[PDB]
Copies of this chain bind each other. A is one copy, B any other.
Amino acid sequence: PHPAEIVAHLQPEIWNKVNRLLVRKAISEYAHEWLLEPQRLGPGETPGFERFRLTLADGAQYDFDAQVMAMRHWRIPPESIVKTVAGVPAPLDALQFVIEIRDKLGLPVDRLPIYMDEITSTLHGSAYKHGRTTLGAAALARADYQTIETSMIEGHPSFVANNGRLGFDAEDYHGYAPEAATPVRLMWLAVHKDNAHFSCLSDMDYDSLMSEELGESAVTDFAARLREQGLHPADYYFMPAHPWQWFNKLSLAFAPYVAQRKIVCLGYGEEQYLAQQSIRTFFNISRPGKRYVKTSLSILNMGFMRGLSPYYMAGTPAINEYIHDLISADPWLRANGFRILREVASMGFRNYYYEAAIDTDTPYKKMFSALWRENPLTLIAPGQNLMTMAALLHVDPQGRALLPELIQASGLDAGTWLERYVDAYLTPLIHCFYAHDLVFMPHGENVILVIQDGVPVRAFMKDIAEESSILNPQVRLPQAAQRLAADVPEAYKLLTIFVDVFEGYFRHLTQILVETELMPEHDFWRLVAGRIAAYQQAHPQRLDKYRRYDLFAPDMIHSCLNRLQLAAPNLPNPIACF
């Protein structure tokens, strides 16, 4: 339609809103990572807080209220932030804020503009989310799996520039952005076996996967269309791709292969999907029980997004199959309910041009891949619902948190609710590490909570082959799942808990718990500590390991996500006192 509509969501008032919100996160997170060292001025405008000041570049000054919580966390009320330049009141402008601290960021002056664009696109995305007609916290807490998934707003809670989606143009955004909730249909391509290869669980094959995913009429029509145009279906696999990847990468940079007919565009599938929060993973909304489809997508989001490297193209299902058997044969895990969502099949098209040119790891070897992942809706009972754990940190555009509504709907009290939640989420991770040296990437985006009438019953873990490690070089592994085993320094064994769970997620959850007056910070950590202690007491025989990898150590390693993206002293351990 009218070319102006794709930016219709960019209004002055809403822009100012999301900018104030981002400056708050920028200050809180940068200060958390020692990038900023706020100086205390005096009492806050609200008793619980102190007034702080940042004296910056361009004569810019920011005063704000803050309560420094555990793990050097800066809790800042957004409305308390006041900016002045040389004494003159100024509007909160997150982009301008980044410019004013460009010297502290440490960015090289050629990546700076890129990071600026990541901030801008993050704001662009924020503006859309806050202006879109969406469910409020109360209604959202009671909504279905996919509604909650698409209604998410914050993204990764630590990264300031977390929703760049650089690569999408203004039209791509409205069609492919998860927040737009626009049904997408896959691009289906015939890939030559000279370049393409396939892997799946021991108990399945390509023929049975395609039969379940595409159906027989579709596969038939694909082999017929190849054969009609003079090709041999025998030399081909059928492979799904993100439409954006086809139009922007595969049809262009992969031109030689298209021209030589190693890649043949078969067109759109008939079934529709909804992009998940990972943008390039799709939930089938047209058919019941179908698998997620995860495709390679060459956009820039935080890091530059990938796709199965040659190794993972081949070993992904092997790794998932080993891990699923491990968790299945574990009596404790079986009783807990914790379970992974298997990437059951994967396929990769290999670009021998890029591989001959670059002998090291590169995003250029990961531009054409796909995998299929277990659908969790088939693995739960009637009366249960699924929600991304990211939902626990959700605050609607009116400022209302989802968590209090969720806990209210459960009928439990915050204490009992948070215990149910901790044993469904944290305890199993801690068991996997102690019993199996098995670690994941346990953040809000990767954990799907099984909810039963407001109550957290158990949890699924996804994103397995590329995040999972067995911190034991001696574990006996199938030949294809070998990179699973890792030889890691001692001080990095518990990183997954200290860094990924505690500082990466719990750190943000306690801010919600305090803002909503659900629970005092210290009460939450006593709770967390009691669950770990309870688990340990019930499995006393690994006391040797509990001592060697001390979860109750005074301090812990502090990983600065933002500092790493742009590319610390240990942090007091919140449960060390218990």
Contacts and interface: CB of A to CB of B under 8 A. Distances in A.
Interface string A104-121: 000001001100110011
A120 B252 CA distance: 8
A3 interface: yes
A224 interface: no
Contacts of A550: none
Contacts of A4: 264-267
A124 interface: yes
Contact of A259 (B12, B116, B261): B12
Contacts of A117: 252-253
Contacts of A121: 252-253, 255
Interface in A109-145: 109, 112-113, 116-117, 120-121, 123-124, 127
Contact of A243 (B3, B95, B96, B253): B3
Interface in A1-34: 2-4, 6-7, 10-12, 14-15
Nearest to A96: B353
Contact of A124 (B169, B252, B265): B252
A358 interface: yes
A408 interface: no
Contacts of A124: 252, 255
Contacts of A246: 3, 170
Given A96-B353, A102-B357, A6 B251 contact: yes
B268 A99 contact: no
A7 B356 contact: no
B12 A261 contact: yes
A37 interface: no
Given A112-B358, A113-B364, A116-B357, A6 B256 contact: no
Given A3-B265, A12-B259, A267-B4, A252 B169 contact: yes
Given A113-B354, A252-B170, A6 B258 contact: no
Nearest to A93: B256
A151 B371 CA distance: 44
Where chain A touches its partner, the secondary structure class is helix
A455 interface: no
Contact of A170 (B58, B169, B248): B248
A415 to B, nearest CB: 44
Residue among A113, A357, A364 with most chain B CB within 10 A: A357
A24 B248 CA distance: 28
Interface in A313-369: 353-354, 356-358, 360, 362, 364
A358 B114 CA distance: 12
Number of chain copies forming the complex: 2
A256 B95 contact: yes
Contacts of A112: 357-358
A255 to B, nearest CB: 5
Contact of A2 (B120, B258, B267, B360): B267
Interface string A65-108: 00000000000000000000000000001011001001000000
Contacts of A99: 353, 356-357
A180 to B, nearest CB: 15
Contacts of A252: 117, 120-121, 124, 169-170
Interface residues of A, number: 56
A187 interface: yes
Contact of A255 (B3, B123, B353, B364): B123
Interface string A222-257: 000000000000000000000100111001110110
A171 interface: yes
A3 B240 CA distance: 13
Contact of A358 (B6, B10, B109): B109
Contact of A113 (B11, B109, B258, B362): B362
B11 A259 contact: yes
A217 interface: no
A175 to B, nearest CB: 12
A12 B230 CA distance: 13
Contacts of A378: none
Residue among A124, A253, A267, A353 with most chain B CB within 10 A: A353
A10 B256 CA distance: 8
A12 B364 contact: no
A17 to B, nearest CB: 11
A260 interface: yes
Nearest to A165: B252
A364 B112 CA distance: 11
A255 B125 CA distance: 10
Contacts of A356: 58, 96, 99
A39 to B, nearest CB: 24
A572 to B, nearest CB: 36
B93 A255 contact: no
Contacts of A171: 247
Q: Which 5 residue pairs across A and B have the least CB separation, nearest first? A: A4-B265, A15-B259, A10-B259, A170-B251, A124-B255
6 contacts: A2-B265, A7-B258, A11-B259, A95-B256, A169-B247, A171-B247
Given A10-B255, A11-B259, A169-B251, 16 more contacts: A3-B246, A4-B265, A4-B267, A7-B251, A7-B255, A12-B261, A15-B256, A96-B353, A109-B360, A112-B357, A113-B364, A120-B255, A123-B256, A170-B246, A170-B248, A170-B252
